[PDB]
Structure formats: C-alpha cells, structure tokens
Amino acid sequence: LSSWRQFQLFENIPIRDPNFGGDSLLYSDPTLCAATIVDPQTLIIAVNSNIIKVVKLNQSQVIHEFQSFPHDFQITFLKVINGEFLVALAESIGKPSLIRVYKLEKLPNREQLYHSQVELKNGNNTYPISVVSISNDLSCIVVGFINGKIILIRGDISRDRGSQQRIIYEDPSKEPITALFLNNDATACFAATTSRILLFNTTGRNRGRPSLVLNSKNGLDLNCGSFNPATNEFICCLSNFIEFFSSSGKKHQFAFDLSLRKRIFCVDKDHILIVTEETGVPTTSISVNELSPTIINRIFIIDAKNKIISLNFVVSSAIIDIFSTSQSGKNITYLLTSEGVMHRITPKSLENQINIIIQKELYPFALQLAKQHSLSPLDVQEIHKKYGDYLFKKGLRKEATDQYIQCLDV
C-alpha cells in the first residue's frame, strides 16, 4: 500500500545452496514435505517420503541420514516442539494415519527407533489431514480434517498412551477446516472453517456446539492465520480488516486494503510478515497478449503501533514454508523457495536505523523512535542538535532556538 511511507530497516541476504553444483543436489527434489530449523546452525530435510536428513548449513555437508516407516508414509508436516522432540506425521490412503515422535540429539539408524505412537482412526480412510496443532508441554493435540471434523487427543504422549480420541464439533454443511491454533498452553483453542471463527474450550464438556460464538459471518482461506505467543493474541486476516482476538475476546480492528492474500505470519509481537501474489491486473483498456508469467511474490512487513512499511522486495520463484525462530534476544526468519534458497532476514542495528531516518529528514518521528528503546541522553542531545541546525539552515530560527534549549551541555 502506498498510503504510508517506505523504510529499509531489516538486513536481508539471499544465498544459494553450494551443493547444487554437481549431482549433490541438496535442493532439487520436490520436497513439499515440511522442514524445521532447531538453532541458527542446523537444518532438517525430508525426501523420498521416508528419508530424513540433517545438514549443517555452515558448510553444506551432510552429517547423518536415515530412513524409517513402511511405504506410503507420505510426510505431510514436520516441526519442533517448545522442547526438543521434533514430532513426525504422515498418512496413507488405505492404512490409517500413524503418528510417531522422536527425540533430539538421538539420531536413528534402524527402522522404527521411536518413542511413542499415535493412532488417529477416522471412519474408513479418506479426506487427508489438514492443519494440526500440538501443545508446548506435550499435553494435548488438536487435529482438523478437510470435511468438518475436529478431533482432540489428550493424556501423556511422552511416556503414556496417546488415548482420549474424543471428537468435538461436527461442522454441518460440509465445510473444510482452514485453521486450528492452540492458544496459551493452559486451556483455549481457536478454530476456523472459512466462516464462523470459533473459541473452543479444551475442557471437553462441550455439547457438540461452538463454545463461544464470534464473528459468525465470514472467515478466511488456508494458512492465513497467526498467533502471537507473547500476549496471547490472534493476529489474522480478513477482507479489509485485521483482528486481535484475545482469550476472553477483544476487537482491536484496523483499516487496510488487502484482497490478494495467501499467507501471513507474525515475528516479534510488533511486526507481521506477509507475502503477496497479484499476477498482473486485467482491465478493458489494456490487452492481454498471452498467458502472462506470474509476477514473483512481493513481501511486506507491516508494523504495529506506528503506521509504516518495513520492507518490500522480490524473491526468486515462490515460498514453500517459513520457520522464523531464533533463541537469542533478536529473532530471524527463513524462507524456502521452489529451487531452494535461504533468505536471511535479521534486525539491523539501531544506530543504522537512526542514521537512515535522519537521512529521511523525519527528525520528530526519530525522537519517539529513539525514546521507545530509551537511548542514552547524549544521543538524544545530539539528535536535538542536528534537528536544530537542520531547522536553522532553512531560515526559521524560533524552533531552532527551542531545540537548542536542551541542546546545551554539549
């Protein structure tokens, strides 16, 4: 959107996998099966539907590889828990879907070498699995299908049986589940089926009904929701609105034009990362010569509090999945394209941001921008000094003296 201003305050570097040269193709096989980073120097990859490999991206040399599961175990998703177990899940067309859990720093070499098993048993075996959510402490897991069925599993998974497959909610009119997000670890669940966003309670005493109805007039498409873990919010997307639903349920509505969404993601409870696909624009005045190639996705990073646009660049081919994790105080994001690249996005230094913002000549904004992080008083005095002289050189002196009032002691 051109309503607000454009900045450059995140360091973005794209790199190419060096093993692609020769036949050591780390990223050439279709591997839509999900992956997940553990620490800034490690990476996991799935291939041929039952091989898991670990690669140290610092040197792009394979460390360990293994293959498990019988045939037809097409890996759907793959992610790491708040701890370190790195659960794995898949399905078969006829054989009931089997879910097992492994342990970090314990690589397997034999066939099973598992820790626990999950036995999701739906009627017959159809309607492949959709978005799933797992508790941080490995307590409850919520699963949603692509017909309107929601299932929950409770109990101990780490050591005991993953029993209690009680089904909750039936979703008449045969609408697929589009989003299942687990809230704060204690007790809450958010659901969506392209309409009637729901506030389900995991107590299990629900009488097959929406626990707390809310905004039962519209919904959202697939993988278009986020969840800030810091303040227990429900950052999501609508036709022209952004919502901040809380545990009890609040509404901090905003205003923005966005009619071409495909995926959203929050970063650091203040900036939201979105990806945009438009593929040209048709109109009567212009003539469509042929099937125009899809213009590559444009990436925006919207910012809360103050209204501003963070970054806007272009990527190579597409986006497969996003990891977006970092143990340190700062946080980093990761993207995987079709051929496979490792776009690195990191927060820039604060002094670079203040330098570019004073180059932008918006000093008064820079005042509270520095005030947010509580900079040293000397830096504030220097900012006042430069603002004062930049005002004085124009020809106006009164506000220059007003700035000079506290520009002393320097």
Partner 1 sequence: WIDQLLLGISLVLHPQHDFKILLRLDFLIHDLPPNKISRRSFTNYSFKIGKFVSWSDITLRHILKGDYLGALEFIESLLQPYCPLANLLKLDNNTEERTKQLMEPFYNLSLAALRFLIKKDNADYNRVYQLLMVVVRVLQQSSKKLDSIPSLDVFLEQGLEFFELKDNAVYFEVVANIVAQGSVTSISPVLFRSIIDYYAKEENLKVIEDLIIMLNPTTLDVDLAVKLCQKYNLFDLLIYIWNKIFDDYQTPVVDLIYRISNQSEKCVIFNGPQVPPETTIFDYVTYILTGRQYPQNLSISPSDKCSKIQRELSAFIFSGFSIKWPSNSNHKLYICENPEEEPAFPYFHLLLKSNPSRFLAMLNEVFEASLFNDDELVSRQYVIDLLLDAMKDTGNSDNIRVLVAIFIATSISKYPQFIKVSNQALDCVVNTICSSRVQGIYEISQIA
Can you give the binding site for partner 1, defined by CB under 8 A? Answer: 121-124, 126, 154-155, 161, 163-167, 170, 172, 204, 208
Instruction: Say how far apart CA 345 and CA 40 lie, in whole Å.
Output: 12
Nearer to partner 1, 164 or 352 (CB): 164
Q: CB-wise, 56 or 209, nearer to partner 1?
A: 209
Q: CA-to-CA distance for 346 and 13, rounded, in angstroms? A: 9
DSSP one-letter code for 54: E
Q: Work out how close the CB of 368 gets to partner 1 at its nearest, in angstroms, rounded to a whole number.
A: 50
Cβ atoms within 10 Å, residue 207 = 6
Q: How far is the CB of 109 from partner 1 (least distance, A)?
A: 21
- Residue 211 vs 337, nearer CB to partner 1: 211
Tokens 């799933």 belong to 132
- Nearer to partner 1 by Cβ, of 172 and 293: the residue is 172
CA distance 76 to 305: 37
Tell me the C-alpha to C-alpha distance, in Å, between residue 396 and each of 77, 146, 364, 389: 62, 66, 16, 10
Nearer to partner 1, 21 or 123 (CB): 123
Query: In the beta sheet, which residues pair with residue 64?
Result: 54
Closer residue to partner 1, CB minimum distance, 172 or 329: 172
Minimum CB–partner distance for residue 375 and partner 1 (Å): 55
Cα–Cα dist 153/145, whole Å = 14
Q: What is the smallest separation between the CB atom of 98 and partner 1, expressed in angstroms?
A: 14
Give how far Cα 344 sits from Cα of 84, 146, 299, 333, Å: 23, 34, 13, 6
Q: Specify the 3-state DSSP secondary structure of 238.
A: coil
Q: Which amino acid is at 154?
A: R
User: What minimum distance in Å lies between the beta carbon of 168 and partner 1?
Assistant: 10
Measured at the CA of 138, the angle between CA 133 and CA 139, to 5 degrees, comes to: 90
Give the nearer residue to partner 1 in terms of CB position, either 153 or 345. 153
Please tell me the distance from the alpha carbon of residue 70 to that of residue 110, in angstroms, as a whole number: 12
Q: Nearest approach, Cβ of 246 to partner 1 (angstroms)? A: 28
Tell me, what amino acid is at 297? N
CA pair distance 22, 60, nearest whole angstrom: 13
Instruction: Kindly tell me which of 165 and 338 has the beta carbon lying closer to partner 1.
Output: 165
Q: What are the backbone angles phi and psi of residue 118, rounded to the nearest 5°? A: -120, 140
- The residue type found at 54 is V
How far apart are CB 91 and partner 1 at their closest, in Å?
A: 15
Shortest CB 220 distance to partner 1, Å: 24
Q: How far is the CB of 87 from partner 1 (least distance, A)?
A: 21
Residue 247 Cα distances to 39, 135, 233, 346, 368, angstroms: 30, 16, 7, 31, 31
Nearer to partner 1, 196 or 269 (CB): 196
Name the token pair of 160: 């005991």
